[PDB]
Design a protein around this ligand. Structure first.
Ligand SMILES: Cc1ccc(Oc2nc3cc(-c4ccc5c(ccn5C)c4)c(Cl)cc3[nH]2)cc1C(=O)O
Ligand SMILES: Nc1ncnc2c1ncn2[C@@H]1O[C@H](COP(=O)(O)O)[C@@H](O)[C@H]1O
Ligand SMILES: Nc1ncnc2c1ncn2[C@@H]1O[C@H](COP(=O)(O)O)[C@@H](O)[C@H]1O
Ligand SMILES: Nc1ncnc2c1ncn2[C@@H]1O[C@H](COP(=O)(O)O)[C@@H](O)[C@H]1O
Lengths: 288, 404, 167
């Protein structure tokens, strides 16, 4: 209702922080160095600059690090030569830029994120050609959270999750507690989801394995051994969930406080029942 | 009698750094104003014709309760009459002389009012470099009124100031040494001694011998009387710190307990009484959402160490050879890259290259500095279809590569 | 449309005569050393002359004219652009191949060398000093790749970009 008209008013500029850091990779840069630079700069993803044609060509995310590993990984006895040798330019051959103006509406941002099925949108100034910031779903929802008392209460916020039918509740991609990392990466490529609930033999979620937990392989340099279990990979940091009867507002508050991208919808115990993601919430607050 | 636009001019109130200031009185009502007189010929004789234009364009847009308001400026074939607010209280300097010192209950209030005026200037990119009790005026209700800018100047992004100006006292150590300075930290230094003069009745750095006076300033050693409490003493030492990086800022002063007590809430932008508008207050009170903190719950997207030692960034490039050799080296380096450039100084080049792909011109500024003793540093600065920031980086990269 | 007539020379009593007074003597007001009078004159040229202590005289630092009889009086040209402040300031106002100040300490404050506390978004940075903007900071070259960085401003925001560029 009023949330839609809200996002049609404010520009993307209103989300850009006062002082931020933006890492940029040239396309002729070695792909292994870039992945290491994401770790050393604390950045999750970087725009790609093609020096020859003088224009931004796309983004390099952790999803690319997953695609590379899964495509070329023979064994822990042999190194991944291509990961060691490929350039960002050359790998983009084996495997169109979507961006948005800072003067564009916040509604156009959410739409663009969904239409193209992306998670991080480059905010590029059409005046200078410079890249300013990378929009995400977390940034957008946390922004709207700052105005839920200024643009007071639509009716659906008080409705339960089961009533609103928000999220996926069929064919949930999960991994076992002993699932090899290589297998987990294969599920990431096949199903194109951002995280995988890790379950035990009983059927309860003991942990969660996000795409973000993959760069840790690049950080600890343990990427040449993808035979280890998914539990072993999550040892370095060793689960947010919700219910079907909880209101949408409670769920939104849960997400923005934890600053995570999704919640696991559980039953009476710890066994899954579905997944409510940030992309599911932003979609429901746009198709109204 | 002498009339200038319904106003009768009178006795000289005094002569500022630039111009003669005499009181004016309304022919019909007796309303008093102060009229600064600027001689157009003396303006054009110097290269300050464009400097006056800037000050007028900035002083006309100012509206602070503790800055002398400019009502209007009258233009004549020979002189400029700047009619501005008149205050009958006189200088603050004469106030500190009438009384012995100033009670800290009143001294604090005057200091709060002054610094409020200074902050307003700094937020409007203006630095008043001649801060002194003689330049702080009083009205009938004991309110500070900053005046006589003259030596003031603007602050550009990526630009330092050169001019050594102001009284021998009240002047920051960097100013008397003729070094480049940012601007704001200089005014803080003047406010430090002003507070000292306000509380003690004397000057922290004073000597009949001018060279010895500069020695004391660069030394940054001054006497702190015992009647000055522990709290206010720590504030003075912070404001008068010799090293401008260790020197306090207005935000630092605003957080000091001696400054916060009995502080009116109408004086500062983010105080409760100061204030689309509602939208900014929501965004401003979300500091962690727009700005980073400084060394709880680790952020979910915090990267682990790669543990290898973190690399350290440095300013531009360096050298240890002769200054002439460096300039001779960077000159032959621009030949191989076809750079067009004008010389502003023996160590300041304004180069420019034409982008062969987009057609746009890419220009930047070069400046050689002096570090330590036997060290040098070449500074790279950008100047305002592809991307300008990328153009600047790619232009710098080519020059750095083909430079030893 | 005021016009200032100021006498800087000495004297006990100074009068002003011109075409406006039909060459009659107008008493001037004295300050300390200044004898001045502000009149309302239209656009064009005006001939004037002073009268000091019983003797006709003119200002040497002013345009003069001879009326073919030896009489010498000053000349002032009241223009239309004399009554607007900015119009008055306006009228009052390469590619060579060639042929050191101390480094300001502010530029030594590298914004990428300071931690931000593990509580906020890793992309966030402290608000930069306005004087360090547009300046280039770099890393030491390792394995053929140069990394450049600078903090630029867009509107009221600040972006610190990093460019990994292999050479
Ligand atoms: C320091 C300085 C500043 C400005 C300057 O140029 C002018 N001085 C002026 C004085 C007056 C003036 C003279 C006498 C006056 C008044 C009102 C009542 N009396 C009795 C104003 C005027 Cl109308 C215009 C002026 N322009 C000259 C000097 C200087 O070098 O002395
Ligand atoms: N703005 C964008 N423009 C073009 N491609 C993108 C963009 N964002 C993401 N991608 C691609 O989508 C992949 C998945 O990343 P993510 O969208 O973060 O899940 C990336 O590795 C890119 O190949
Ligand atoms: N583990 C999962 N299994 C199945 N679907 C999922 C899973 N995680 C997220 N989704 C769905 O994938 C879509 C995009 O979510 P995300 O990749 O988190 O932006 C949404 O419809 C989610 O409900
Ligand atoms: N529902 C959840 N429960 C526990 N941890 C989570 C959850 N969602 C994301 N994370 C963690 O949050 C971090 C960022 O992941 P993401 O939210 O996908 O950006 C990773 O360490 C994830 O394992």
């Amino acid at each position: 209702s009023v949330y839609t008209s809200f996002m049609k008013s404010h520009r993307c500029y209103d989300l850009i922080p006062t002082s931020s850091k933006l890492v940029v990779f040239d396309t002729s840069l070695q792909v292994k160095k870039a992945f290491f630079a994401l770790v050393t700069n604390g950045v999750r993803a970087a725009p790609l600059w093609d020096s020859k044609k003088q224009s931004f060509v796309g983004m390099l995310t952790i999803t690319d690090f997953i695609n590379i590993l899964h495509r070329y990984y023979k064994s822990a006895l042999v190194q991944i030569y291509e990961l060691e040798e490929h350039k960002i330019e050359t790998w983009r051959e084996v495997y169109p830029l979507v961006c948005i103006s800072p003067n564009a509406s916040l509604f156009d941002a959410v739409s663009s994120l969904i239409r193209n099925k992306i998670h991080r949108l480059p905010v590029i100034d059409p005046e200078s050609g410079n890249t300013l910031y990378i929009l995400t779903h977390k940034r957008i929802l946390k922004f709207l959270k700052l105005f839920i008392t200024e643009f007071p209460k639509p009716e659906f916020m008080s409705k339960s999750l089961e009533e609103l039918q928000i999220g996926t509740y069929a064919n949930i991609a999960m991994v076992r507690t002993t699932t090899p990392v290589y297998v987990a990466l294969g599920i990431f490529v096949q199903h194109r989801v951002s995280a995988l609930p890790v379950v035990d033999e009983k059927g309860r979620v003991v942990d969660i394995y996000s795409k973000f937990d993959v760069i840790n392989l690049a950080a600890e340099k343990t990427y040449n051994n993808l035979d280890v279990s998914v539990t072993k990979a999550l040892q370095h940091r060793s689960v947010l969930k919700c219910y079907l009867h909880e209101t949408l507002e409670t769920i939104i508050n849960r997400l923005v406080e934890a600053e995570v991208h999704r919640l696991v919808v559980v039953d009476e115990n710890d066994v899954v029942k579905g997944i409510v993601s940030l992309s599911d919430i932003l979609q429901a607050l746009v198709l109204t | 009698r002498v009339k200038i636009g319904h106003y009768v001019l009178g006795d000289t109130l005094g002569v500022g750094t630039f111009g003669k200031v005499k009181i004016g009185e309304h022919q019909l009502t007796g309303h008093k104003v102060a009229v600064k007189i600027l001689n157009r010929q003396k303006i054009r004789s110097l290269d300050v014709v464009g400097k006056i234009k800037r000050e007028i364009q900035n002083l006309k847009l100012f509206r602070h309760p503790h800055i002398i308001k400019l009502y209007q400026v009258i233009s004549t074939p020979t002189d400029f009459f700047m009619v501005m607010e008149y205050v009958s209280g006189g200088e603050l300097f004469d106030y500190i002389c009438k009384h012995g010192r100033v009670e800290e209950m009143e001294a604090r209030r005057l200091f709060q009012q002054i610094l409020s005026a200074v902050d307003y200037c700094h937020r409007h990119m203006v630095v008043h470099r001649d801060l002194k009790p003689e330049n702080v005026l009083l009205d009938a209700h004991m309110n500070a009124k900053i005046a006589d800018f003259g030596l003031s100047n603007m602050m550009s992004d990526g630009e330092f100031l050169r001019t050594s100006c102001g009284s021998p006292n009240y002047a920051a150590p960097e100013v008397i040494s003729g070094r480049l300075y940012a601007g704001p930290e200089v005014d803080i230094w003047s406010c430090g001694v002003i507070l000292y003069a306000l509380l003690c009745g004397t000057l922290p750095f004073d000597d009949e011998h001018v060279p010895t006076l500069f020695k004391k300033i660069r030394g940054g050693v001054f006497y702190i009387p015992e009647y000055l409490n522990r709290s206010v003493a720590t504030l003075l030492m912070h404001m008068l710190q010799v090293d401008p990086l260790k020197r306090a800022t207005i935000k630092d002063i605003r957080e000091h307990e001696w400054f916060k007590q009995d502080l009116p809430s109408y004086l500062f932008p983010e105080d409760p009484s100061y204030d689309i508008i509602d939208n900014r207050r929501i965004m401003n009170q979300a500091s962690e959402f727009y700005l980073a903190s400084s060394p709880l719950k680790p952020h979910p997207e915090r990267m682990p160490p790669l543990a290898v030692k973190k690399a350290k960034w440095h300013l531009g490039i360096r050298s240890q050879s002769k200054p002439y050799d460096i300039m001779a080296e960077v000159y032959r380096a621009m030949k191989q890259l076809d750079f067009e450039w004008k010389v502003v100084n023996a160590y300041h080049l304004r180069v420019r290259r034409k982008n062969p792909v987009t057609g746009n011109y890419v220009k930047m500024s070069l400046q050689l500095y002096l570090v330590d003793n036997r060290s040098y540093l070449l500074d790279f600065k950008s100047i305002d279809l592809g991307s300008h920031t990328m153009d600047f980086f790619e232009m710098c990269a080519s020059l750095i590569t083909t430079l030893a | 449309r005021p016009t200032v007539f100021r006498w800087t020379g000495g004297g006990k009593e100074v009068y002003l005569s011109g075409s406006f007074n039909n060459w009659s003597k107008l008493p001037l007001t004295r300050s300390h050393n200044n004898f001045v009078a502000i009149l309302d004159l239209p656009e064009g040229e005006h001939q004037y002359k002073f009268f000091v202590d019983g003797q006709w005289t003119h200002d040497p630092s002013e345009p003069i004219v001879t009326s073919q009889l030896g009489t010498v009086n000053n000349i002032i040209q009241v223009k239309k652009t004399d009554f607007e402040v900015f119009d008055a300031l306006m009228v009052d106002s390469q590619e060579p191949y060639v042929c050191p100040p101390i480094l300001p300490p502010h530029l030594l404050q590298v914004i990428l060398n300071k931690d931000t506390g593990i509580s906020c978004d890793p992309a966030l940075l402290p608000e930069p000093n306005h004087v360090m903007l547009n300046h280039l900071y770099a890393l030491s070259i390792k394995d053929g790749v140069m990394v450049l960085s600078a903090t630029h401003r867009y509107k009221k925001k600040y972006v610190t970009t990093l460019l990994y560029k292999p050479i």
